[PDB]
Design an enzyme around this catalytic site. Structure first.
Site, PDB file in Angstrom:
ATOM      1  N   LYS A  69       0.821  -1.203   0.000  1.00 52.29           N
ATOM      2  CA  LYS A  69       0.000   0.000   0.000  1.00 52.29           C
ATOM      3  C   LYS A  69       0.863   1.265   0.000  1.00 52.29           C
ATOM      4  O   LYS A  69       0.421   2.284  -0.542  1.00 52.29           O
ATOM      5  CB  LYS A  69      -0.950   0.025   1.209  1.00 52.29           C
ATOM      6  CG  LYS A  69      -2.175  -0.881   1.098  1.00 52.29           C
ATOM      7  CD  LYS A  69      -2.964  -0.992   2.391  1.00 52.29           C
ATOM      8  CE  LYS A  69      -4.285  -1.710   2.223  1.00 52.29           C
ATOM      9  NZ  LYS A  69      -5.290  -0.902   1.486  1.00 52.29           N
ATOM     10  N   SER A 183     -14.152   1.538  -6.932  1.00 46.41           N
ATOM     11  CA  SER A 183     -14.421   0.132  -6.516  1.00 46.41           C
ATOM     12  C   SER A 183     -14.287  -0.256  -5.038  1.00 46.41           C
ATOM     13  O   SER A 183     -14.953  -1.216  -4.646  1.00 46.41           O
ATOM     14  CB  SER A 183     -13.433  -0.700  -7.326  1.00 46.41           C
ATOM     15  OG  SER A 183     -12.107  -0.246  -7.181  1.00 46.41           O
ATOM     16  N   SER A 184     -13.430   0.420  -4.278  1.00 45.65           N
ATOM     17  CA  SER A 184     -13.171   0.069  -2.859  1.00 45.65           C
ATOM     18  C   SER A 184     -14.414  -0.367  -2.081  1.00 45.65           C
ATOM     19  O   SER A 184     -15.363   0.425  -1.975  1.00 45.65           O
ATOM     20  CB  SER A 184     -12.643   1.244  -2.202  1.00 45.65           C
TER      21      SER A 184
HETATM   22  C1  LIG Z   1      -5.793  -7.315   2.176  1.00 45.77           C
HETATM   23  C2  LIG Z   1      -6.197  -6.653   0.881  1.00 45.77           C
HETATM   24  C3  LIG Z   1      -6.077  -5.293   0.716  1.00 45.77           C
HETATM   25  C4  LIG Z   1      -6.413  -4.658  -0.501  1.00 45.77           C
HETATM   26  N1  LIG Z   1      -6.217  -3.304  -0.632  1.00 45.77           N
HETATM   27  C5  LIG Z   1      -6.477  -2.757  -1.829  1.00 45.77           C
HETATM   28  C6  LIG Z   1      -6.219  -1.351  -2.055  1.00 45.77           C
HETATM   29  O1  LIG Z   1      -5.729  -0.617  -1.208  1.00 45.77           O
HETATM   30  N2  LIG Z   1      -6.572  -0.822  -3.274  1.00 45.77           N
HETATM   31  C7  LIG Z   1      -7.122  -1.592  -4.293  1.00 45.77           C
HETATM   32  O2  LIG Z   1      -7.392  -1.027  -5.381  1.00 45.77           O
HETATM   33  N3  LIG Z   1      -7.349  -2.911  -4.118  1.00 45.77           N
HETATM   34  C8  LIG Z   1      -7.066  -3.458  -2.941  1.00 45.77           C
HETATM   35  N4  LIG Z   1      -7.271  -4.818  -2.762  1.00 45.77           N
HETATM   36  C9  LIG Z   1      -7.864  -5.603  -3.865  1.00 45.77           C
HETATM   37  C10 LIG Z   1      -6.847  -6.342  -4.721  1.00 45.77           C
HETATM   38  O3  LIG Z   1      -6.059  -5.383  -5.413  1.00 45.77           O
HETATM   39  C11 LIG Z   1      -7.590  -7.228  -5.727  1.00 45.77           C
HETATM   40  O4  LIG Z   1      -8.429  -6.389  -6.565  1.00 45.77           O
HETATM   41  C12 LIG Z   1      -8.487  -8.306  -5.093  1.00 45.77           C
HETATM   42  O5  LIG Z   1      -7.948  -8.742  -3.848  1.00 45.77           O
HETATM   43  C13 LIG Z   1      -8.710  -9.493  -6.008  1.00 45.77           C
HETATM   44  O6  LIG Z   1      -7.494 -10.194  -6.323  1.00 45.77           O
HETATM   45  P1  LIG Z   1      -7.092 -11.553  -5.508  1.00 45.77           P
HETATM   46  O7  LIG Z   1      -8.307 -12.467  -5.524  1.00 45.77           O
HETATM   47  O8  LIG Z   1      -5.957 -12.109  -6.321  1.00 45.77           O
HETATM   48  O9  LIG Z   1      -6.664 -11.102  -4.096  1.00 45.77           O
HETATM   49  C14 LIG Z   1      -6.930  -5.444  -1.559  1.00 45.77           C
HETATM   50  C15 LIG Z   1      -7.089  -6.818  -1.367  1.00 45.77           C
HETATM   51  C16 LIG Z   1      -6.711  -7.433  -0.191  1.00 45.77           C
HETATM   52  C17 LIG Z   1      -6.826  -8.932  -0.069  1.00 45.77           C
HETATM   53  O1  LIG Z   2      -7.905  -0.306   1.758  1.00 45.80           O
HETATM   54  C1  LIG Z   2      -8.879  -1.035   1.737  1.00 45.80           C
HETATM   55  O2  LIG Z   2      -9.583  -1.327   2.685  1.00 45.80           O
HETATM   56  C2  LIG Z   2      -9.257  -1.620   0.419  1.00 45.80           C
HETATM   57  C3  LIG Z   2      -9.366  -0.879  -0.739  1.00 45.80           C
HETATM   58  C4  LIG Z   2      -9.748  -1.532  -1.959  1.00 45.80           C
HETATM   59  O3  LIG Z   2      -9.878  -0.984  -3.058  1.00 45.80           O
HETATM   60  N1  LIG Z   2      -9.972  -2.883  -1.849  1.00 45.80           N
HETATM   61  C5  LIG Z   2      -9.870  -3.643  -0.711  1.00 45.80           C
HETATM   62  O4  LIG Z   2     -10.091  -4.846  -0.716  1.00 45.80           O
HETATM   63  N2  LIG Z   2      -9.503  -2.959   0.423  1.00 45.80           N
END
Ligand SMILES: Cc1cc2nc3c(=O)[nH]c(=O)nc-3n(C[C@H](O)[C@H](O)[C@H](O)COP(=O)(O)O)c2cc1C
Ligand SMILES: O=C(O)c1cc(=O)[nH]c(=O)[nH]1
Ligand SMILES: CN(c1ccccc1)c1ccc2c(c1)CCC[C@H]2CNc1cnccc1C(=O)O
Length: 356
Positions: A69, A183-184
Site C-alpha cells: 500500500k 471500486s473500494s
Molecule cells: C488485504 C487486501 C487489501 C487490498 N487493498 C487494496 C487497495 O488498497 N486498493 C485496491 O485497489 N485494491 C485493494 N485490494 C484488492 C486487490 O487489489 C484485488 O483487486 C483483489 O484482492 C482481487 O485479487 P485476488 O483475488 O488475487 O486477491 C486489496 C485486497 C486485499 C486482499
Molecule cells: O484499503 C482497503 O480497505 C481496500 C481498498 C480496496 O480498493 N480494496 C480492498 O479490498 N480494500
C-alpha cells in the site's frame, strides 16, 4: 518444483498458523522489502511479453494493489518475478484506516475478507519513497517491468475529484500508470471526476505522463457497467482493472468468518471477476486494455481472464496461501497452456473467447 510443494504444504500453513492475517501481511511486506525471498529461477520467455498502455511487460502477472500500500517493497516484488507492480491505494493525507481486527482468513474457501479502510502513509511519504528509486524504476520500466500507482481518497474528503487530482499531481510523475478506484468495498459525476483526472494527467510533462485506468468492483449493475464503458470510451481512459473485492458473499462459503464486513478476495471471486472482464471487453469493443484480477492462482486461472479479454493479470490472495513460488507457478502453467491451445504468445490469446 520442490519449493512450490514445500511452501504450499508446510511453510506457508505454519506461518499462517502462527500469525493473525494483518501481522502476516506486515511480516510479508517486511521480508519482501529486504529481498529475503527464494531464488526465482523461471526465466520469462518471449511468449509472455505483452505491449500495452504504452509499455513493455516482460510477463503479464502483476501484484495487485493492497499488498504494498505504501510503496515499501517494490524491488522485492520484481525479484519475486512479477512482470509489473502496483502500489497503493495511497490517500492524499496519512490516515490510519479502520479499527482492528480488519483482515480475516477463510482457509476453507481460499479467500480473504478485508476492511482495511485505506490505511495509508499518504502521498508525501510515498512520493519521497518513489523518488529515492526513481531512476532505478526508469531502467526497470525500460527493461519491461512497469510500475503502477493506485490512488485513493481520504475518509473525510468533501470532494473525491480533488483527492484524485492531488494524487495525479504528486505520484503521476513517478508512475507508468495510475489507477482511480470506483471500486473500494450518476454517469455525469463519474464523467466529471474522470474528466478532472485526465486534465490533471495531461498537464504533466510528456516523459512524466502516465496512463490512467479505472478499477471497478464486481458488484456493479448492468446499468453501471454500461455507463462506465460509455464514459471510458468517451473520455479516452487508457484501461480498466477488473476487479476489486466483492461485498457479496457467494453461496457456499464455508469459512467461519464469512459474515465479516469487508471485501472478499480469492477463489470465490474468481469467476465473478472473469465474467466482469468478459462484459467490459464486449462493452468497449475490445479497444480498452483490461488488467484482470480476482482469484488467480494458476495458469488456467490467468488464461481464462486473458481469453475473456485481459491483456494483463494481477494476483494477491494466492500469494498469502502459496507464498512466492506462486508467481513462477502461474507463469510456467500459463506458458504451457498457451502452447497446448496453439497460441503464439499471450498477445494472441487476449479476447480469444470473443472470436469464438
Ligand atoms: C488485504 C487486501 C487489501 C487490498 N487493498 C487494496 C487497495 O488498497 N486498493 C485496491 O485497489 N485494491 C485493494 N485490494 C484488492 C486487490 O487489489 C484485488 O483487486 C483483489 O484482492 C482481487 O485479487 P485476488 O483475488 O488475487 O486477491 C486489496 C485486497 C486485499 C486482499
Ligand atoms: O484499503 C482497503 O480497505 C481496500 C481498498 C480496496 O480498493 N480494496 C480492498 O479490498 N480494500
Ligand atoms: C514474501 N513471503 C515469503 C514467504 C516465505 C519465505 C520468504 C518470503 C511471504 C509471502 C506471503 C506471506 C508471508 C510471506 C508470511 C505470512 C503469510 C503471507 C502473507 N499473508 C497475508 C497477507 N495479506 C493478507 C492476509 C494474509 C494472511 O495470511 O491471511
Amino acid at each position: 518444483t520442490g519449493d512450490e510443494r514445500f511452501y504450499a504444504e508446510h511453510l506457508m500453513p505454519t506461518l499462517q498458523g502462527l500469525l493473525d492475517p494483518e501481522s502476516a501481511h506486515r511480516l510479508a511486506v517486511r521480508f519482501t522489502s529486504l529481498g529475503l525471498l527464494p531464488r526465482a529461477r523461471f526465466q520469462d520467455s518471449d511468449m509472455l511479453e505483452v505491449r500495452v498502455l504504452g509499455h513493455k511487460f516482460r510477463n503479464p502477472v502483476g501484484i495487485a494493489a493492497g499488498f504494498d500500500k505504501h510503496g515499501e517493497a517494490v524491488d522485492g516484488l520484481y525479484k519475486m518475478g512479477f512482470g509489473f507492480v502496483e502500489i497503493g491505494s495511497v490517500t492524499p493525507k496519512p490516515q490510519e484506516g479502520n479499527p482492528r481486527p480488519r483482515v480475516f482468513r477463510l482457509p476453507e474457501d481460499q479467500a480473504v475478507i478485508n476492511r482495511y479502510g485505506f490505511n495509508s502513509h499518504g502521498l508525501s511519504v510515498v512520493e519521497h519513497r518513489l523518488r529515492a528509486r526513481q531512476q532505478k524504476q526508469a531502467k526497470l520500466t525500460e527493461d519491461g517491468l512497469p510500475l503502477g500507482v493506485n490512488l485513493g481518497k481520504n475518509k473525510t474528503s468533501v470532494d473525491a475529484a480533488e483527492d484524485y487530482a492531488e494524487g495525479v499531481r504528486v505520484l503521476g510523475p513517478l508512475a507508468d500508470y495510475l489507477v482511480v478506484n470506483v471500486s473500494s468495498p450518476g454517469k455525469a459525476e463519474l464523467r466529471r471526476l474522470l474528466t478532472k483526472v485526465l486534465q490533471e494527467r495531461d498537464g504533466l510533462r510528456r516523459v512524466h505522463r502516465p496512463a490512467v485506468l479505472v478499477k471497478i468492483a464486481p458488484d456493479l449493475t448492468s446499468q453501471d457497467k454500461e455507463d462506465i464503458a460509455s464514459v471510458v470510451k468517451e473520455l479516452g481512459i487508457d484501461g480498466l482493472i477488473v476487479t476489486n473485492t466483492t461485498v457479496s458473499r457467494p453461496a457456499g462459503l464455508q469459512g467461519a468468518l464469512r459474515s465479516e464486513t469487508g471485501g472478499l478476495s480469492g477463489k470465490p471471486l474468481r469467476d465473478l471477476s472473469t465474467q466482469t472482464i468478459r462484459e467490459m471487453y464486449a462493452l468497449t469493443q475490445g479497444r480498452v486494455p483490461i488488467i484482470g484480477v480476482g482469484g488467480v492462482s494458476s495458469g488456467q486461472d490467468a488464461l481464462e481472464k486473458i481469453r475473456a479479454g485481459a491483456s494483463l493479470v494481477q494476483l494477491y490472495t494466492a500469494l498469502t496461501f502459496w507464498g512466492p513460488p506462486v508467481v513462477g507457478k502461474v507463469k510456467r502453467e500459463l506458458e504451457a497452456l498457451l502452447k497446448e491451445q496453439g497460441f503464439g504468445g499471450v498477445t494472441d490469446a487476449i479476447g480469444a473467447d470473443h472470436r469464438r
